[PDB]
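Contributing new complexes? Match this layout with 3-methoxy-4,5-bis(oxidanyl)benzoic acid.
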Amino acid sequence: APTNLEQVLAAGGNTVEMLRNSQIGAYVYPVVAPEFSNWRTEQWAWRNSAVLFDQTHHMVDLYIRGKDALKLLSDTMINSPKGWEPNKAKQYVPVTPYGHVIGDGIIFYLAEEEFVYVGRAPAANWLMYHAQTGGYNVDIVHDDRSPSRPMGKPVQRISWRFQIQGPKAWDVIEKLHGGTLEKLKFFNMAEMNIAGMKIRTLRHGMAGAPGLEIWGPYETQEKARNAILEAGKEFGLIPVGSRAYPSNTLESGWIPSPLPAIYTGDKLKAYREWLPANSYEASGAIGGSFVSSNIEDYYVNPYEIGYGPFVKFDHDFIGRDALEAIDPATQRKKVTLAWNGDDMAKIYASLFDTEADAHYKFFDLPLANYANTNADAVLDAAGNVVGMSMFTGYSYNEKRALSLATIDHEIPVGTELTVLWGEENGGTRKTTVEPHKQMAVRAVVSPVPYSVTARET
Amino acid sequence: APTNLEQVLAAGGNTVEMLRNSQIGAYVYPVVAPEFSNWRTEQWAWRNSAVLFDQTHHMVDLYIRGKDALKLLSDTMINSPKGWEPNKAKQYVPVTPYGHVIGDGIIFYLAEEEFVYVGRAPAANWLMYHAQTGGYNVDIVHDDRSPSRPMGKPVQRISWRFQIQGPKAWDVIEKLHGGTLEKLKFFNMAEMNIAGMKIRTLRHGMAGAPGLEIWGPYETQEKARNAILEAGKEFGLIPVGSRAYPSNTLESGWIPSPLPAIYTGDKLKAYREWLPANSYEASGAIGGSFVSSNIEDYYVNPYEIGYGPFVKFDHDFIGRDALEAIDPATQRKKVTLAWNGDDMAKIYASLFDTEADAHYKFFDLPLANYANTNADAVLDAAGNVVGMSMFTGYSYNEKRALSLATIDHEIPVGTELTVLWGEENGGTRKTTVEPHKQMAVRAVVSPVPYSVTARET
Ligand SMILES: COc1cc(C(=O)O)cc(O)c1O
Ligand SMILES: COc1cc(C(=O)O)cc(O)c1O
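Output block (do not edit by hand):
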């Protein structure tokens, strides 16, 4: 019966309990081969040689054209539109009227009245809703991320999208280009030669080395891919697969999985009526140890996950008044949490105990998430919840399990907290969860981007 | 330049060293989604509820038709042809003139002059060679296993092939059939109803519960798959993905990966000239701690991996004389090795040591192989090599790492040996291998099929 999220929520009991027991399964990074060599060597190459990241399949793309396109984005983003011109990209972040993050993505200003959104579903959904119901003179082409389990079916995108990253990436880029390529400022766009094609570029980088994101029409994917791989052998470039790939952001610091904060509030009811019953927001899952019967406890505002610096009060936008009323000095702060290696060893050891009644929650390598939204409790020494850990995995470059979290602003760097790993009462009904008991994992507050930190007494 | 395996070996230095450093990458079980729920729950269901195994993609299929088809198989198999009639299947095992296993697979006698081979490449290759060069009046249609990394390309087979297994499999099978279905003897063939289709069946089973293998033309895959899943929800049937699937044989006892023993011997030279330079035999890899500069040390004969009982001296076949000269009472015997849980814990712990110069070889879950052929050394207490461990992984049903091995026939059950886990000198150049140090893993000799065994002093 339910045709939209509002009807789903009305019929579905407690919103938290429904999302924490969803049958959606794992959040999949599809189509790209899980591994080309092995995920450990693949993680190693983006820090030590060079890599081809295949981003063609795991992101929703929105092609946005028309007279009101720039107004649609300015009206919905916390980011400043002042001065924005073609061949500059921005990390679009929209908030609700209540000041809460909906999602985020990359918006390329491609030409006059021509933009492309690239990112997870939630902010794509928000943009389409306003384009359709807010009377904007704009046309949108929605190109979904690829199916999670194609089972041999053919897969199409409108565009291929790659990154070339690593200490030797610029050497590869210039070999392909045929000569020196100017390094623009971060997120500025230009072009380059690849095998006789003019390929548009986005200045990017990782861990102190310059890189590029590149894209083109789907039909030229192979021509570009093979040229990239051939030219990069000299420099040790290797392709990264979908198993190692999503773990990159544990080193970089971007949290991909804020819960879209749209489940409550009278001002968001018309959006809940617009969202389909099988949307990301209605069908996805929440996993982790953090428990509240109030879904609002899972929301974040832009200051709390590091988008503070993007907030510019120089234009009209949804939620501006809620953002102006916040004091940025008191908000939770994004950090990296370095997980105690002895606790990790204990977690894995329990998989090999033939006598014990329960084991600790399976921690997959190199990504350990088991929902599309992650929410593990971060506790102080007395047991008070002092933060939310939101993306969890392992880095072969550090030999450490890491997670990205938002924590009370007064917790100094170097403090030893605990992350509660696993779910209660033996686990929710998520099809990603096996029966297990919880552990309080020691974790050390560290900077973002991550860097090794001492442990205060 | 090289167009065949002979030219590859002549040009490629030491045969062992070439195979132990191959750049082929991992041996992949393709197309089927890695997981549908999670591999732990998927392993659990084939022992506790019911499962749909998707076998459509990881095996080479040979369709063999014509007057000499049955003679081709009798001439090349150790198995008896006496009495063989349509609607009976056999586990075809061919040996070389020197008595050594080439490979194995399942041969279905489908009708008069109509057979299908289903299995890994090596025995498929052996059959095609004799069909082409031995003057058999026979026609063969070769249908390769699916590509390891299709990257969104469409994938076709001639047939889909499923198994339904688990304690409740027969309940699912009879629900689909619409009434009682007679349980034939193992490997006898008949038919059943699925959604209005007559589906051919192969009597099968697992761990004491009856099951079926089923197959049909590729175009009806979805119709059968969805009918199987719908009817099985009542009984808790779930689909198994490609991550959990190949680990099943650690509980059942079949060793899938004997090295095709074709690299030496004057009688095999014409076969080496026939095998392509990019064949399985020329391009694949050997991984594990067992080191010999003689490739013959990697061969096995049928007695050593449990095909002894299939050997019937009632027909003429390649290698018969070599097999008659063997004494079965002195050959190595297949066993299961139960790996010490403390040693497993030590292996995983080392991934989280930020101080140590090297860690132990990464043991993936639930399958840990890193080549298409596996060869780890099994040692006694003095350090003598007393066996070869050939398939390695983990069972969530046992909470144990296990491997299948062949060991000297006098080692009694319950004896504690060691498996040397990892490769020497920091590892071969296989793209599956990260830098690592070796460990001698304690392993307890156990029956095949596996069952928990006490440890003798
Ligand atoms: C930019 O593409 C990414 C997406 C996710 C995600 O959507 O979860 C995680 C990552 O580390 C990525 O690099
Ligand atoms: C029968 O299909 C299988 C093939 C392999 C293999 O080819 O390695 C391993 C298995 O456990 C299987 O069940």
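Reviewers usually confirm one structural detail per submission. For this one: The CA atoms of residues 103 and 258 of chain B lie 6 Å apart.
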